[PDB]
Amino acid sequence: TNLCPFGEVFNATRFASVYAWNRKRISNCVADYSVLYNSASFSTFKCYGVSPTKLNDLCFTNVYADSFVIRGDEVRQIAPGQTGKIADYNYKLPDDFTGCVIAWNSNNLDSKVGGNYNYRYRLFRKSNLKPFERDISTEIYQAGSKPCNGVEGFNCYFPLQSYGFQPTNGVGYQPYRVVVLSFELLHAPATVCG
Amino acid sequence: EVQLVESGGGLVQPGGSLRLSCAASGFTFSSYDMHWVRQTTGKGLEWVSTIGTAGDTYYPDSVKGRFTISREDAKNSLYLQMNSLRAGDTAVYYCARGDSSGYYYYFDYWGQGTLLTVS
Amino acid sequence: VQLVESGGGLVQPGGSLRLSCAASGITVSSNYMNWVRQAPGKGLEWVSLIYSGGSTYYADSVKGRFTISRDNSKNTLYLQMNSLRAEDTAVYHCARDLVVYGMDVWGQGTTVTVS
Amino acid sequence: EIVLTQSPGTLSLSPGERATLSCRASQSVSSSYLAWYQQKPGQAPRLLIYGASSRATGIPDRFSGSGSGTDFTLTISRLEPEDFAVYYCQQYGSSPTFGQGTKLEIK
Amino acid sequence: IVLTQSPGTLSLSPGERATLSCRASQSVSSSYLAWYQQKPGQAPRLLIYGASSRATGIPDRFSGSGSGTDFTLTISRLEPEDFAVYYCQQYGSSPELTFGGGTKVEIK
Amino acid sequence: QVQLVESGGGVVQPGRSLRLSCAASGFTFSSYGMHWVRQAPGKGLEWVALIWFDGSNKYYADSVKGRFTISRDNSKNTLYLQMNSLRAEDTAVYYCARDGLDLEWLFGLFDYWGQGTLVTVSS
Amino acid sequence: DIQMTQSPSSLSAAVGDRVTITCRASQSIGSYLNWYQQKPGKAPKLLIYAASSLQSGVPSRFSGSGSGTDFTLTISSLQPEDFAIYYCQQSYVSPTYTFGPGTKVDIK
Ligand SMILES: *[C@@H]1O[C@H](CO)[C@@H](O[C@@H]2O[C@H](CO)[C@@H](O)[C@H](O)[C@H]2NC(C)=O)[C@H](O)[C@H]1NC(C)=O
């Protein structure tokens, strides 16, 4: 019994890009949600299926923590029943999502003068990503009917595109650190409660 | 028996401020969540703010920064502090009690409300 | 590569019409496809956009009225226009969108007149 | 949500000179989504520049864009009889947004 | 961290069947063992990645198989150009990037 | 089709500096990872260094860290590896390759190699 | 921003008739619906929560059914006291709960 790992997810030095999103499993710890409250910095605290004021009286078998870095003007895509470049190729949440998603600002924690081109996202994909799936590939997208082998030219494009975060940049186009805590419940007995 | 007598309404100049309360009775006021719900002739019932059992506050996009909510366990009083009022703020404000059945959330008992008008 | 449009004609106000944009050299079912119209005396204007995954996006002035669909077998992109109004008279071009690289393949367009 | 205004509305020049066409945005937007376009009368538009300074494939070397932030500029080194048409600047938020169009005319 | 290839000198006549191995402890992360081909005096080229696949331009006569500790590379009838030294590599994570040794094949 | 060439090499007495260069073309040289694999004669292969897209995330090897610097230019399409305090074992053929992975979930794998350059260290 | 639509906006019936109003959702919100009844000028009250559970003290005539993006509230036999403006609200997305427009049930 110890305080849960919700101290490094929100305070890590390096954050993951959208396509290669890192996932943490949290189990066998006493839930300490007090850090989320009275923070005055979380610019988006939305919960789906469970209220945020009733988090301390609920039993959760497994808690999954997922972390991305997306553009400010597309945080709204992270929700059940939403469509877009992110919610259809990069990340996906099922229509019965049971968790809380949080996102704050990192205007000067990830941005550097001249542009931090580290963060990338999927721009081309054939189909719709299945929920809670991470498809990672470098295979070059074939837009036309002619098979393409390795070369990059017409009708043959790279799947990943980099962001352009900068110091003097608009609020909607500024980087955001977004965390998802899916409070999934399993038919197996709830080993951990509270 | 749970009565929520809201008070503090009245004519107020634009950009002014008020401190309207909601007195309760008949139950413990430290184990339940408080919300503010307003009713307008135009957009109907809306959720304005809320306060929990651990000092957490939640405000809509428009409400954020302007209005603040507060609790007082000793005197059984729930407050709403309003700053920089706008013209389109006239409504009847109801304080509601939040109750739960597992994962579902609902409002069980409601007050009477006060008329608030900005002139 | 070519984009050939069809289905244009004269339709009385309030009626229905069905435009088609057959494509050769680029797959309709694997790229972002755009419908952009050109009213006379005015510049271009976005109408709709369909993702490779089936997502649909429409402009504010055409919400609920227009429907965009595609069929893989015939490799033809459509646009269904119901509840037509007099302000929809323009030339409709189909384009393939690369977002970062812009739209580089266009069609000569189909002409729609309502009166 | 993004309104792009190009100034001037109609620029009158002569062949060989250097053109200065701009596209100003209401809010600062990433330079990796700005594409200039050209359209001659009775014709489908042609892609000139994508991003901010990259010539599209098959495009001559006269066109050379520049700028970042809110103010952008399209520059033609020497005007030719084939470079007098309508120019568009396209942006990309949640969906494409187009400008009002600028037409080059002979002095 | 360490990689072992045996036998280092395989005597095989043209055609027939060939077998190679890149056994090593500290089992791979998921399937990350790659194979390379090095004709004499020229830069090496990849053949199989992911422990079972083919790179762009690898004929169907090269096949890969293996999971965990033991891995194999299989070639059908050898044309008189696939007689060179091959290399096997672990990739995927950390600075643990290591190459094996050498498994050149004899003509006769 | 990926083209990699190498420039720089020769004979240098131990205790001076040398600078390599690997120009590349045929693909976008801002979205792919670089490498440096060297080969002493008749011994085997060994990886040396790696650089990301932005040129800020260099991961050297255990036996070269301290006197090697890997530099990347994206406006010129040229990779670099500066060599300082050369020892006797440092003579080899240096190969520049291209990383064929996403560099975040996985890194490593080489898809296309260059040709190579002999460098000798003696007097 | 979750839109909520209710129809019809007006429904008149004689005493003892069967009254049915419909609640529709912008997106699939499961079974997180709550009903309300508001006498003219008085305090609104909760009738049914989660679209199937009866509140602690409510006339047995009211009943609820529906799932997904369409929900229905049923009244068996209308009484003179059941003339009010009804509301339906979702509890799926929190803390920004959004109500419907409301339905005024007139008595003829
Ligand atoms: C991440 O680190 C910050 C500080 O670097 C933490 O903020 C502190 O929170 C404690 C908890 O009450 C306060 O007493 C401190 O005053 C805060 N620091 C400052 C500078 O105000 C934050 O809590 C950390 N995140 C988590 C999840 O623990």
Numbering used by the authors:
A (entry chain E): 333 to 526
B (entry chain H): 1 to 119
C (entry chain D): 2 to 116
D (entry chain F): 1 to 107
E (entry chain B), G (entry chain L): 1 to 108
F (entry chain A): 1 to 123
Paper text:
Here, we identified an R452-dependent monoclonal neutralizing antibody, ConD-852, from a primarily Delta variant-infected individual, indicating that the mutated R452 residue has good immunogenicity. The SARS-CoV-2 Delta variant harbors two featured mutations in the RBD, L452R and T478K, which mediate its evasion from some WT viral infection-induced RBD-specific nAbs and vaccine immunization. Overall, we predicted that ConD-852 was an R452-dependent mAb belonging to Class 2 nAbs, which was elicited by the SARS-CoV-2 Delta variant initial infection.
To elucidate the structural basis of ConD-852 recognizing the R452 residue, we determined the cryo-electron microscopy (EM) structure of ConD-852 Fab complexed with the Delta RBD. The heavy and light chains of ConD-852 bury surface areas of 639.3 and 30.2 Å2 on the RBD, respectively. In contrast, the ConD-852 light chain almost does not participate in direct interactions with Delta RBD. Five paratope residues of the ConD-852 heavy chain (S31, Y32, N57, D102, and E104) interact with five epitope residues on the Delta RBD (R346, S349, Y351, R452, and E484). ConD-852 and ACE2 do not exhibit spatial clashes despite sharing some binding footprint.
